Amino acid sequence: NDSSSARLFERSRIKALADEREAVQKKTFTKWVNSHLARVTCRVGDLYSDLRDGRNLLRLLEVLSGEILPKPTKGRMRIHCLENVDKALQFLKEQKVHLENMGSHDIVDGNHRLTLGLVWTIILRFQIQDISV
Amino acid sequence: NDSSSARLFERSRIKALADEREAVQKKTFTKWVNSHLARVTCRVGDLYSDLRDGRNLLRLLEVLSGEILPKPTKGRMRIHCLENVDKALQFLKEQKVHLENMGSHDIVDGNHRLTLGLVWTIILRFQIQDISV
Amino acid sequence: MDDDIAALVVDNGSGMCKAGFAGDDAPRAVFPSIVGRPRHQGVMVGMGQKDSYVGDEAQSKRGILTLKYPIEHGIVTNWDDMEKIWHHTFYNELRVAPEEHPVLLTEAPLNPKANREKMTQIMFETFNTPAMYVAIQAVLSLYASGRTTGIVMDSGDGVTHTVPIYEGYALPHAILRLDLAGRDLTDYLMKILTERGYSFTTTAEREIVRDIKEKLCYVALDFEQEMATAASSSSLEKSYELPDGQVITIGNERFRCPEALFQPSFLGMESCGIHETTFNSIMKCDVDIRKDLYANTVLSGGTTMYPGIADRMQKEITALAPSTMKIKIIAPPERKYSVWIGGSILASLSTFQQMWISKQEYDESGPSIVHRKCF
Amino acid sequence: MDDDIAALVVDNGSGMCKAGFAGDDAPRAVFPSIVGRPRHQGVMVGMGQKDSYVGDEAQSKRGILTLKYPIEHGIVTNWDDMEKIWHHTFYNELRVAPEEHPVLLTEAPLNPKANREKMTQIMFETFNTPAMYVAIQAVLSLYASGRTTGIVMDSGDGVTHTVPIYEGYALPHAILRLDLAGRDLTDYLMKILTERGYSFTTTAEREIVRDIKEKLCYVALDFEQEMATAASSSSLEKSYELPDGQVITIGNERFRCPEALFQPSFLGMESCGIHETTFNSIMKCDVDIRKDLYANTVLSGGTTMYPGIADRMQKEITALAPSTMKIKIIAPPERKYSVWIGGSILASLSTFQQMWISKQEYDESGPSIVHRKCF
């Protein structure tokens, strides 16, 4: 009746297959975003920290769409960061990237599966929908 | 729990922002008043001393309104100066510049934030209200 | 297949969604089939709007949020929320367009007809699915069990089944679904935990006492003797801790909660325990092949994850069936997940790869050909 | 913004007004919310008429003047005197016309409805305010604390609060205001200082013993042991000096005065100390998120400026809450001013810049839309 410890092994391999996905996928995004944020001369060695503020995700959306997005207050504080990603989410819900756990705090916290879960949905609506210029 | 010494720093910057206000504002008044007291050939290098007697503030109000105001007794003494500013305050309460800490002794003492607090309210009721001619 | 065309297997069982590509041994996406919706208001400028939290993030904000299964015991209640856990599945775990993939779905048998054709439709039409297949749960758990003979008992989060089989041939009249699963036992655990004074009137803590249950609450092999030694609490009592930091102690309330699986009078229905239900299935079966149903009782599902089940089973169908012969029960690991895993290997079989409801197969022909392919 | 349109943030807390433009880190205007009115007559020809001294000049002539808060614990008592400290704020510190600016006001929560709509009206109508926003105190102190999770305890001069929050979502039923602040403790200090023979029957010296309090009177970490060693006066006794030049000595009267924050029976009410009030707020909260209220108790306000508060807090909610987990308290600098500073950065956020009560929004629609925007 040993499905429990087998669940401790399986779920470790659930997210092992998801990390083997999300890391190569993060580098798909990484060379994809450094093909774009290099227009504004920003280089990404880490999605989860560079685009963490939201304003840097705003820089990406200003590159991809070739447009301008508002840059509200930023600093140390949480509200500083959440507002910035709430403008990114303003343009991303404008681009119909839903709030299916693709969040403000998810970018601020750098949530490994939803920061990439947001911006890979940005890839799945850049080469599908008009996040491009 | 260090809001106290941080208050010794903050309040120094409270009135630092207020002095960066009130000095440029004093020169706003200074070139404004030397654009007017030059009609009676009085030059202002210091609001807080030139218009300190009240009679010199009375000279300004005689210029701005283009009118005549009584010049009561002046000298060394405090009452000499307070009476003069009490005629200025007579014409300024006539012009609805209140006595919200915009005082006789405030002009006589040359209170840095209320001498300018009076005469900037004179600017805020010259270009708003009819302290002009 | 397999990151190519790559049939998406998505086990939409109650309580939990489990999704991955074809051929995957592990559903990379596992997260609760829930939608978090805020209850109390918040005046904060710059705050996640987040009207609709979905799935596993609603586990994070359980206090504010109204936790809600979009599905109920295989029957899909809320279709757009069902599409929220779907679109989150396909764009935040599977992270891919179903617009290319077949979507090997999983569904409960003896389903009213809208929950097949609309479960397929919102795939075909809101998503695009060039192909797909909604699928019976217990058979796919037999695909990970990999056998063709016996009777499968899939108690997921919502529904316990008893689905017989004999060398590929199923006996439909002998298939019996039943509402005895983890969603039910936590309500029984709710009413039986408050006799100690612990009330949890919020779904947030319904899942937490379900977590108590999925850890502590095993099945009494013999019941009223475990209640007899529930007089002297020696080991039956144990300390649990809350996310608040408070401590529970539960004694007998452990084993009697999943006894409602075996004595549903603790819930208060007509329903017999799961052992009489598989036994009742074999009443409806054929005397030649009824022997092979005894020795091959298969277990499956998330509620079947508990200790003390299968030995009580071998005891009790021994009491029920002819004990002259053998009643082995086959309880493999990953029995919650075997439903999905056997689907993830079903799509690998190329004969199944002609058994898809393709796109134009849905569009021009019908939504009723879903029923012609999925039965 | 910022000397342009430039939302005026004016923290009209009891005891002290704190005002500056949007974006300012320092409220250039800080001065006591008082109005000085002369008591004794004076026959002197040429003397400041000055019927209504206002604000910080009344600190200069405290002997003659009747010092009077126009506001009482967030509830505005005298509206024209409220307009005196306003018009002095706007023409002698901010030195500008509100006729152009939004006025980001600050107000206590759980406010009777006139103190929102009339606080807004005398702005809209006596002044002109093209826009404005009265605002809850503790949230804006969380804006300078810059967080979204925990519980904020804003004890200004008049009201202590306990305002919970969790990722932008507040819990309104768990919000608790209370009258335990600097205005109260100086009355307790008055009744407890006269046992040494020092009576101060004038508001002039109520603020001076409040000044004693805001310097000397800390919070006993443990109380009755500091009273036990109040037997042998070694350091607890200290010399203070008056503006007259007289000397005080206070020993135990130091720590027990803000113990009324923690044991309001020294005042003599039902009220528990502030630690039981935040603990009582977390009684009303949700077991998932109650953990994040423990480790994120935030401090704010002018009465919270005293030593020994926050360590007594971590001691006592440890005594109250599950000590299995952690109870950190976050007491940033400028906690009297964080209420204002976080407002001075709130107006900077352009999403907030659509959350203003504009002029015609007040005029044609209602004074009750103030309540629709400010809650």
Author numbering:
A (entry chain b), B (entry chain f): 1035 to 1167
C (entry chain B), D (entry chain F): 1 to 375
What does the original paper state about this entry?
The β-III-spectrin ABD comprises tandem calponin homology (CH) domains and the L253P mutation is localized to the second subdomain (CH2). Recently, our group reported that a SCA5 missense mutation, L253P, localized to the β-III-spectrin N-terminal actin-binding domain (ABD), causes a ~1000-fold increase in actin-binding affinity.
The L253P ABD yielded high-quality complexes of decorated filaments, enabling a three-dimensional reconstruction of the mutant ABD–actin complex at 6.9 Å resolution. First, the density map reveals that only a single CH domain is bound to actin, as observed previously for the α-actinin ABD. Second, the bound CH domain has an additional N-terminal helix that is tightly associated with actin (red). The β-III-spectrin cryo-EM structure showing the N-terminal helix bound to actin suggests that the helix must contribute to binding affinity. The ABD is then relieved of its regulatory mechanism allowing for the CH1 domain to interact with actin filaments, aided by an additional N-terminal unstructured region that becomes helical upon binding actin.
